[PDB]
Design a protein around this ligand. Structure first.
Ligand SMILES: CCCCCCCC/C=C\CCCCCCCC(=O)OC[C@H](COP(=O)(O)OCC[N+](C)(C)C)OC(=O)CCCCCCC/C=C/CCCCCCCC
Ligand SMILES: CCCCCCCC/C=C\CCCCCCCC(=O)OC[C@H](COP(=O)(O)OCC[N+](C)(C)C)OC(=O)CCCCCCC/C=C\CCCCCCCC
Ligand SMILES: CCCCCCCC/C=C\CCCCCCCC(=O)OC[C@H](COP(=O)(O)OCC[N+](C)(C)C)OC(=O)CCCCCCC/C=C\CCCCCCCC
Ligand SMILES: CC(C)CCC[C@@H](C)[C@H]1CC[C@H]2[C@@H]3CC=C4C[C@@H](O)CC[C@]4(C)[C@H]3CC[C@]12C
Ligand SMILES: *[C@@H]1O[C@H](CO)[C@@H](O)[C@H](O)[C@H]1NC(C)=O
Ligand SMILES: *[C@@H]1O[C@H](CO)[C@@H](O)[C@H](O)[C@H]1NC(C)=O
Ligand SMILES: *[C@@H]1O[C@H](CO)[C@@H](O)[C@H](O)[C@H]1NC(C)=O
Ligand SMILES: *[C@@H]1O[C@H](CO)[C@@H](O)[C@H](O)[C@H]1NC(C)=O
Ligand SMILES: *[C@@H]1O[C@H](CO)[C@@H](O)[C@H](O)[C@H]1NC(C)=O
Ligand code: ALF
Ligand SMILES: [K+]
Ligand SMILES: [K+]
Ligand SMILES: [K+]
Ligand SMILES: [Mg+2]
Lengths: 262, 987
């Protein structure tokens, strides 16, 4: 009976219930209409996806950045890195790649029609062995045992994005600040040149290609001085990949602080 | 504190009391000791309060304290985050700085709102005399007035302000000006013989700071400094309890409401955050966000701006105000206690009536001579006009041809000035008419004669006859006259004529007027040749058996506008009271003329006279009016004062002292009434300070009244009170409209945060953008609602009830928060989800997505299409959500200001473009939205993105729904006034 009698409380409550029910119904109708208009295969816009981001494995983050430190002589220092690399490559084992098909086009894999089972588009097979020497076989340590660690660089997939077909997009990893007496960082890449083959592009979306797997590039570093804190930046050299965004550091390029101990 | 009772004591008792001498005075050593003891003979000005201390209070309050707490949370969060090495939340520091700036700017606006630049206390120094002649050790020597102490034998002469309350011992034709006490400039005799019990009305007590007009008088000093009457008045006026203004009360009330809701929301959802798994620092940031969303940042400032605009409109009519809070009180006022002399009248004796031809003629008394005139085409009238022109010694100041006649300066008696101005107004040049009728004998007003007589040679040289003309008391001329100008002829006197004359005299006296007789005789050239020197002392004139011309009465008349102003104030439901120091008969006459007493209303004595029944048996409930003088009121107890106030709606207090004026004001206030006091004098100043709002006349006003007042009528136009009432009510209605508009957008700023905490969607709105809504896009439209017209007849409405009627009540708050704010929230969230989904983030994926969305270590989060997003790209998408929510609020606020123009009337009926300021504010709001969205650099500056246009168009249906539903609500309120709809959904 605070301000008004009980009957009036019931009436004002019923009015507010009706008001909020009607407004919630209007909101549900708006969202229903919006999802009716939304296209199930291609996003309406890609205003924030103009250039793809780049990530690396194993991802160990330090002080606002990718900090990877291990001591070669102690195995437990790099056991986590090896285990996570294996866990990441289990998804590229050929058992998991069964859904995708083999390709040798070496050119853009344009598809306009749904020829795969239940109205889908083909994806191409990328297996673990294609990494060869960093593929977890026959060395399970990925070279972290011998001081030549194997780093897998992956590109963020964007629908209907073409990275330019003058040549396959390539990885070039180097020291961010080259020491004057230091030799430039030599890295062996797997596949040759560390290139993403053009038949993996374009990506058509999770609905069109439910079994799509991104191509990988394994960068085996060979010129890392021991007991020295070095910073290495990996960039993607594609025509339509730009790495000049100071606000986003992972757009087209990835940097990580590495310290291999002895 | 001592009361004066020395006026009754004799010379011997005074000598024994003050150890003084009636002729020698005080000894110098004793005088110095008494000076050391009692201090000087000067008023002590209260220090007051410092400027900066009052400013410090402004930086406190409900909203102020909430913003201090919110900035404290922000600074603590930033410091803790930085101490761990993270520096990404520089936004927290910027938020802290902006909140502090908001607090300080709000404090400056609040200080400017209540600021008075008047010193007030410094008024009581221009009334204080500087020099004072004092008799010590039997020597008359001059000293400064500050040095006087009680017991000093002071001599004063005409033209010199009295230096203290003085027990007059010797007097030779002394007359004083007791205006600072009674409001009357009528000269009062001073003589040693006591005439009254009360020390105020006696003739043997001069007062500190009263201008001694003429003559010389001697006296002992009984009171010095603040112990004097003027000292008591100054202490009551300068030092009175500070009273909160009604608009300030309303502001503090609605601040309480907002603070309560903010604390409630913040604490409830802090508890929710703690239960559902948030850290203490995170829940603190949430509480900060909820407080910032709930607090109105620009509201108090826009209130000040609206008050400034109302003050500008008022001052455009010469109605200057002294603090912006005063701009509203009159609209809320339900009682107007009003001074009489100078306030309701022009304080100038003028001719009121003329009695001749057996007829009472009313002459026009307005200062601009815009009123009805009397008939001037009678032979008796022409003879009378000549006579009243001729019996006059006063003259104007030469060179005042341009200055109007009533305002023109004269030297003489008050009666003489009135008669001269009346003759100048009736004729061309009274100076000319009196010079062309040369004067040969002049007998001024004498105590023994009891009249004024003069002998004049007729202007026409063909008639060498000499016209005797006389002026005096009606009854005193009746016995000195034998014929009478009746209908233009000389008629002998009969008992019927004496009865008529007596009836006329009694009628004119009972209208509170001084009546003067007029008569004339023509002297033939037979007995009096042209070269007959008319000696005064010889008395060769018959000096009797003359011919009565006609009776004239004078009164201080109301100003021309005042009757209309009082009638309008009474129509607006305002009770009008006259508190005055003038005599009861004059006060009742003026009340009847002005309209304070209606026509037909009568007093207990009026009913008793009509019924020829004694006063005791006259039932009080039948008397609509009541005249109470100072004596009766003084012994009247507070319960009896309240009973009288209830019993009689038309009240006149007469012969009252300034303390009694204050007692009356505080009695009206204790009855839950907002009281205005209108005065112009020093005796009005305590009441002007006690009143909710004090209004002072500009020209006629004195410095004490002007310093105590809150509002001044520069042009002396009393009808500006009506304009002030209208503007106060209008600004109250428009203030609540503007407040409702401002409050509405608080909910669309709060709901994203509650949804963020609860559903863990990515952040829809930011604190910076919330501040942008409050400080930029909300300011102009809300202020522009101060220019709305009145919808109904406000001046016919009755005053609001200060307990019941409020600025922000529960209906206003509920409508704004839980209906319009709810719609605007729904609009914002529709736009948010649309923008998210068009960019690949379907509504189901957003739910629970906050932890992965805000992970710096998750640089390949997938959207609903399988696309992988970095943290930077997700942040820029979040900024797009910010802008889309901000634009939704801006458009819904356009619709909301379109519906806030009226509370009971249709937009189609009142018109959309009547208010140009509103449409310009709408254009401004859209322009700033566009500039913030599309200026280069904004994504990095203020987290505003260039959004696509369909996202502008999305909330327009919700804007339209707001408009339509509000219009339908108003339609229902209009159609069914006695309905549950009107009772619950009107605000
Ligand atoms: C003070 C008390 C306040 C009380 C407020 C109550 C608010 C009630 C409002 C909404 C409740 C739920 C409404 C949901 C209606 C959805 C209608 C619907 O059936 O849609 C279908 C979608 C499924 O799409 P799909 O996967 O097939 O599409 C794939 C695209 N294709 C189809 C082409 C392949 O289902 C979906 O969207 C599911 C996700 C729905 C969106 C979640 C909304 C939650 C957020 C609510 C906040 C709203 C504002 C509250 C402000 C209150 C103001 C005071
Ligand atoms: C006057 C005082 C009144 C008091 C009345 C209280 C009544 C309501 C109180 C409790 C009822 C709800 C109980 C909640 C149970 C626990 C839920 C929980 O433990 O969830 C866990 C998640 C945290 O896991 P994560 O994945 O985020 O961690 C990610 C970690 N990283 C970021 C490092 C990767 O919690 C999160 O932090 C994110 C939130 C997700 C769960 C939300 C659950 C809340 C839903 C509905 C509550 C509705 C209350 C509405 C009240 C209206 C008031 C007008
Ligand atoms: C003016 C005064 C205004 C006052 C307004 C007060 C507003 C307060 C309203 C409270 C309503 C309570 C809403 C409770 C929602 C449930 C919260 C929850 O715990 O959410 C469960 C899942 C979350 O997903 P997840 O944890 O699997 O993803 C996480 C993936 N990880 C683990 C890797 C990070 O959400 C789902 O399943 C779908 C659940 C759908 C919920 C729709 C709620 C709409 C209701 C109201 C609007
Ligand atoms: C869950 C059951 C038991 C109760 C449901 C109450 C719900 C519907 C909520 C939603 C909106 C709320 C109302 C919002 C507005 C008002 C007007 C206010 O001046 C009184 C409270 C009142 C009336 C609130 C009471 C509680 C309320 C009616
Ligand atoms: C690396 O590990 C070995 C074995 O645990 C230890 O002896 C050595 O000191 C470590 N390296 C450094 C730089 O400490
Ligand atoms: C979809 O296709 C897969 C193989 O591509 C098949 O195993 C599955 O049964 C299909 N589902 C339907 C509903 O046809
Ligand atoms: C790759 O593996 C082969 C296996 O024989 C080995 O000889 C070669 O050294 C490896 N390459 C590097 C860079 O270690
Ligand atoms: C690159 O793609 C274009 C079509 O986009 C095609 O015409 C061209 O032949 C391609 N270049 C090569 C070298 O295959
Ligand atoms: C890339 O690999 C090819 C082998 O087909 C070789 O000819 C070429 O030199 C390599 N380029 C780089 C930059 O390693
Ligand atoms: F002017 Al007044 F009482 F009428 F002081
Ligand atoms: K706010
Ligand atoms: K006042
Ligand atoms: K607001
Ligand atoms: Mg006065």
């Amino acid at each position: 009976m605070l301000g008004r009698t009980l009957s009036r409380w019931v009436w004002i409550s019923l009015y507010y219930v009706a008001f909020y029910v009607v407004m919630s119904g209007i909101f549900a109708l708006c969202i229903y209409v919006l999802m009716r208009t939304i296209d199930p295969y291609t996003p309406d816009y890609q205003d924030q996806l103009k250039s793809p981001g780049v990530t690396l494995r194993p991802d160990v983050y330090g002080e606002k950045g990718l900090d990877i430190s291990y001591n070669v002589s102690d195995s437990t220092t790099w056991a986590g890195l090896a285990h996570t690399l294996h866990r990441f490559l289990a998804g590229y084992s050929p058992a998991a790649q069964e859904g995708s098909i083999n390709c040798t086009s070496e050119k853009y894999f344009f598809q306009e029609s749904f020829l795969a089972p239940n109205h889908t588009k083909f994806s191409c097979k990328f297996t673990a062995d294609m990494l060869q020497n960093c593929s977890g076989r026959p060395d399970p340590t990925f070279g972290f045992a011998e001081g030549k660690p194997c780093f897998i660089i992956k590109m963020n997939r964007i629908v209907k994005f073409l990275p330019g077909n003058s040549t396959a997009p390539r990885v070039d990893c180097a020291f961010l600040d080259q020491p004057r007496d230091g030799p430039p960082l030599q890295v062996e890449y797997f596949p040759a040149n560390g290139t993403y083959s053009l038949h993996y592009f374009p990506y058509y979306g999770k609905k069109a290609q439910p079994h799509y797997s991104n191509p990988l590039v394994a960068a085996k570093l060979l010129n890392v001085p021991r007991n020295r804190d070095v910073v290495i930046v990996c960039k993607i050299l594609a025509e339509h990949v730009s790495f000049d965004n100071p606000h986003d550091p992972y757009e087209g390029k990835v940097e990580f602080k590495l310290k291999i101990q002895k | 504190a001592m009361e004066i009772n020395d006026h009754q004591l004799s010379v011997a008792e005074l000598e024994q009391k003050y150890q003084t001498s009636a002729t020698k005075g005080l000894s110098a050593s004793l005088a110095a000791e008494l000076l050391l003891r009692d201090g000087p003979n000067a008023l002590r000005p209260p220090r007051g309060t410092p400027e900066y201390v009052k400013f410090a209070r402004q930086l406190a309050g409900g909203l102020q304290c909430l913003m201090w707490v919110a900035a404290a949370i922000c600074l603590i969060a930033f410091a803790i985050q930085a101490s761990e090495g993270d520096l990404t939340t520089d936004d927290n520091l910027y938020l802290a700085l902006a909140l502090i700036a908001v607090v300080v700017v709000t404090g400056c606006f609040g200080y400017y709102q209540e600021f008075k630049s008047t010193n007030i206390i410094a008024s009581f120094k221009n009334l204080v005399p500087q020099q004072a002649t004092v008799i010590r050790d039997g020597d008359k020597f001059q000293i400064n007035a500050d040095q006087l102490v009680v017991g000093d034998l002071v001599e004063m002469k005409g033209g010199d302000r009295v230096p203290a309350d003085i027990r007059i011992l010797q007097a030779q034709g002394c007359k004083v000006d007791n205006s600072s006490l009674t409001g009357e400039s009528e000269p009062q005799t001073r003589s040693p013989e006591c005439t009254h019990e009360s020390p105020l009305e006696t003739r043997n007590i001069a007062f500190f700071s009263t201008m001694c007009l003429e003559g010389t008088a001697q006296g002992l000093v009984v009171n010095t400094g603040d112990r004097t009457i003027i000292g008591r008045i100054a202490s009551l006026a300068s030092g009175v309890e500070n009273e909160k203004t009604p608009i300030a009360i309303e502001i503090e009330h609605f601040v309480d409401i907002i603070a309560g809701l903010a604390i409630l929301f913040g604490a409830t959802f802090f508890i929710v955050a703690m239960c559902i798994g948030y850290t203490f620092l995170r829940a603190m940031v949430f509480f900060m966000a909820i407080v910032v969303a709930n607090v109105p940042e620009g509201l108090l400032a826009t209130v000040t701006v609206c008050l400034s605009l109302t003050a500008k409109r008022l001052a455009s009519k010469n109605c200057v105000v002294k603090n912006l809070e005063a701009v509203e009180t009159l609209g809320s006022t339900s009682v107007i206690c009003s001074d009489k002399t100078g306030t309701l009248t022009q304080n100038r004796m003028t001719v009121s009536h003329l009695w001749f031809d057996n007829h009472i003629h009313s002459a026009d008394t307005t200062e601009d001579q815009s009123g009805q005139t009397f008939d001037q085409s009678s032979e008796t009238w022409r003879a009378l006009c000549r006579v009243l022109t001729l019996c006059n010694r006063a003259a104007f100041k030469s060179g005042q041809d341009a200055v109007p006649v009533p305002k023109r300066i004269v030297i003489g008696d008050a009666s003489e000035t009135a008669l001269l101005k009346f003759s100048e107004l009736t004729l061309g040049n009274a100076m000319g008419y009196r010079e062309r009728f040369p004067k040969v004998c002049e007998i001024p007003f004498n105590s023994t004669n009891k009249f004024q007589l003069s002998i004049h040679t007729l202007e026409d040289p063909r008639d060498p006859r000499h016209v005797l003309v006389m002026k005096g008391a009606p009854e005193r001329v009746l016995e000195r006259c034998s014929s009478i100008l009746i209908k233009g002829q000389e008629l002998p006197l009969d008992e019927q004529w004496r009865e008529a004359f007596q009836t006329a005299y009694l009628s004119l006296g009972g209208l509170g007027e001084r009546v003067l007789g007029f008569c004339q005789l023509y002297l033939s050239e037979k007995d009096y040749p042209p070269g007959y020197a008319f000696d005064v002392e010889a008395m060769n004139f018959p000096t009797s058996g003359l011919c009565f011309a006609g009776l004239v009465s004078m009164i201080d008349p109301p100003r021309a506008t005042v009757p209309d102003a009082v009638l309008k104030c009474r129509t607006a439901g305002i009770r009008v009271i006259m508190v005055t120091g003038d005599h009861p008969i004059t006060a009742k006459a003026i009340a009847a003329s002005v309209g304070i007493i209606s026509e037909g209303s009568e007093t207990v004595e009026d009913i008793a006279a009509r019924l020829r029944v004694p006063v005791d048996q006259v039932n009080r409930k039948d008397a609509r009016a009541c005249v109470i003088n100072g004596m009766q009121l003084k012994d009247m107890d507070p319960s009896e004062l309240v009973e009288a106030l209830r019993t009689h709606p038309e009240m006149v207090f007469a012969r009252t002292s300034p303390q009694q004026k204050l007692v009356i004001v505080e009695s009206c206030q204790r009855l839950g009434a907002i009281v205005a006091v209108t005065g112009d004098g020093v005796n009005d100043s305590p009441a002007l300070k006690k009143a909710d709002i004090g209004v002072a006349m500009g020209i006629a006003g004195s410095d004490a009244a002007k310093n105590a007042a809150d509002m001044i009528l520069l042009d002396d136009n009393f009808a500006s009170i009506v304009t002030g009432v209208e503007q106060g009510r209008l600004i109250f209605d428009n203030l609540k409209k503007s407040i409702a508009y401002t409050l509405t957008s608080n909910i669309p700023e709060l709901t994203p945060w509650l949804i963020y905490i609860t559903v863990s969607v990515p952040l829809p709105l930011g604190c910076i953008t919330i501040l942008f809504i409050d400080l930029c896009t909300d300011i102009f439209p809300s202020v522009s609602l101060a220019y709305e017209k009145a919808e109904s007849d406000i001046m016919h409405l009755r005053p609001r009830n200060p307990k019941r009627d409020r600025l922000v009540n529960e209906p206003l708050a509920a409508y704004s928060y839980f209906q319009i704010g709810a719609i605007q929230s729904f609009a914002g969230f529709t736009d948010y989800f649309t923008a998210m989904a068009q960019e690949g983030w379907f509504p189901l994926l957003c739910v629970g997505l906050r932890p992965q969305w805000e992970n710096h270590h998750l640089q390949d989060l997938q959207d609903s299409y399988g696309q992988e997003w970095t943290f930077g790209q997700r942040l820029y998408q979040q900024y797009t959500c910010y802008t889309v929510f901000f634009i939704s609020i801006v458009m819904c606020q356009i619709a909301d200001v379109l519906i806030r123009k009226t509370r009971r009337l249709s937009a189609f009926q009142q018109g959309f473009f009547r208010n140009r300021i509103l449409v310009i504010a709408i254009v401004f709001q859209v322009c700033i939205g566009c500039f913030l969205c599309y200026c280069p650099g904004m994504p990095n500056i203020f987290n505003f993105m260039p959004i696509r246009f369909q996202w502008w168009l999305v909330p327009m249906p919700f804007s339209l729904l707001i408009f339509v539903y509000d219009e339908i609500r108003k339609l229902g309120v209009r159609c069914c006034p006695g309905s549950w709809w009107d009772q619950e959904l009107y605000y």
